[PDB]
Design a protein around this ligand. Structure first.
Ligand SMILES: [C][C]1O[C](O[C]2[C]([C][O])O[C](N3=[C]C([C][O])=N[N]3)[C]([N]C([C])=O)[C]2[O])[C]([O])[C]([O])[C]1[O]
Ligand SMILES: [C][C]1O[C](O[C]2[C]([C][O])O[C](N3=[C]C([C][O])=N[N]3)[C]([N]C([C])=O)[C]2[O])[C]([O])[C]([O])[C]1[O]
Ligand SMILES: [C][C]1O[C](O[C]2[C]([C][O])O[C](N3=[C]C([C][O])=N[N]3)[C]([N]C([C])=O)[C]2[O])[C]([O])[C]([O])[C]1[O]
Ligand SMILES: C[C@@H]1O[C@@H](O)[C@@H](O)[C@H](O)[C@@H]1O
Ligand SMILES: [Ca+2]
Ligand SMILES: [Ca+2]
Ligand SMILES: [Ca+2]
Ligand SMILES: [Ca+2]
Ligand SMILES: [Ca+2]
Ligand SMILES: [Ca+2]
Ligand SMILES: [Ca+2]
Ligand SMILES: [Ca+2]
Lengths: 114, 114, 114, 114
């Protein structure tokens, strides 16, 4: 199934934050309505916050996360969870190798903000 | 129901990161085995990271997040979500006022690391 | 925070299913637009499906689950999770006593159907 | 990433319930320790419960859900979510066709029971 694609409320600000846990340098690209809106990168095996940014989901609300290492796309896992019918998290894990810890880049999208 | 309390696997490193979305200064306390292990404080209405740290869950695995604003305890919401049977998120929102956006401090715990 | 309240897309069929795990007879009421639309009762300590049914979310999309044991309301927990940006689960646990297993009545709402 | 595989606490009873939403007949196999422990089958486009059972997770706790339709395995999506640190749901959706609604067999595992 497709992973890393979320329909957010239209025209709404959201946070997107990436954490690294791998010997490989991660590159995280965040697309809004199919165009790159943020790129984060770094290399840590201790959960460094390699990027965090506030973006607007735009008129369609479509947000997609893709992760690569060495130009090679990582395998993604994702889900969205909503607490008390209002607080939202869109969650992504990714695997760049063979150990299947899926934490090599971790991306959290949260809304609403403010 | 109690919120903000999670049982992690014992003796396991985990990340904890907090964001703020309120006019009030947030104070986030993280307890491991009922003892304070990290404290973050800051103010933002734009989802700024007010702290990030790596902690060890110790022999009990018990981790608790508590949020207060000028000593006033915030009401919490929380859940844990596991992707591909590997990647864990323990998520907390909190409310310091009346609007019930529950984003006034948002805390993300993630494991495994590395 | 409020629990057991979910906003579904309007005029959409959804499934609601209740399980019991308690010595007390559970009463589960499912409200759509603040009016009872399904009701299930029963006693099990083995996860009996005390009822399942297909409902329509109607014009408001507002769905609320209430649980009681001989008229005494149980304490609720809930969340919603979305898989591959399309498959929705609204989840409820409830506690009728002191042990805080929160499984005394468990309710799962799922959509879309068909 | 692998989907439909969950590690439960060892030697713990859990409920498993399957719903169908497709023209095709669904066969759902539930494996414990890599051997089939239960099989459900049925056809519905109205979310009928095609099976429900209580099983033991056994010594290893490894539980896997597989879904077959028309002679081929369906594509799965899954996650686990824990409420109030007590109540566990392991959730599976599956796609047997081309519309990507992922509801063709929906499987809910819940624990603890009793
Ligand atoms: C730490 C770690 O990181 C990572 O892993 C890795 C892999 C994948 O990426 O890879 C490997 N390799 C590399 C090479 C070059 O040649 N080879 N092999 C590595 N190793 C070394 C020794 O280097 C590793 O590290 C991830 O995935 C994991 O999870 C961890 O984090
Ligand atoms: C922005 C916002 O923030 C917050 O809210 C707030 C409240 C609660 O906290 O409070 C109020 N107030 C304060 C005071 C002092 O005295 N009074 N009242 C505020 N307002 C003002 C004008 O200041 C507000 O702001 C939260 O909760 C929300 O959500 C938002 O974020
Ligand atoms: C099995 C169980 O169930 C339940 O718990 C119960 C409680 C709450 O509900 O309660 C009690 N009690 C009752 C009475 C009348 O008289 N008293 N006390 C019971 N016990 C007996 C002996 O009966 C119990 O059982 C729930 O919550 C739990 O979780 C379990 O399931
Ligand atoms: C009636 C249809 O049957 C199969 O084609 C399913 O894959 C569709 O999702 C739909 O349920
Ligand atoms: Ca890895
Ligand atoms: Ca890793
Ligand atoms: Ca607020
Ligand atoms: Ca706020
Ligand atoms: Ca109970
Ligand atoms: Ca019980
Ligand atoms: Ca389908
Ligand atoms: Ca279908």
């Amino acid at each position: 199934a497709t992973q890393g694609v979320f329909t957010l409320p239209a025209n709404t600000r959201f946070g997107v934050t990436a954490f690294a846990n791998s010997s490989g340098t991660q590159t995280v690209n965040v697309l809004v309505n199919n165009e790159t809106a943020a790129t984060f990168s770094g290399q840590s095996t201790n959960n460094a916050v390699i990027g965090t940014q506030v973006l607007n989901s735009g008129s369609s609300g479509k947000v997609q996360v893709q992760v690569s290492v060495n130009g090679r796309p990582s395998d993604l896992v994702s889900a969205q969870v909503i607490l008390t019918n209002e607080l939202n998290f869109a969650l992504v894990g990714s695997e760049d190798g063979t150990d299947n810890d899926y934490n090599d880049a971790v991306v959290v999208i949260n809304w609403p903000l403010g």
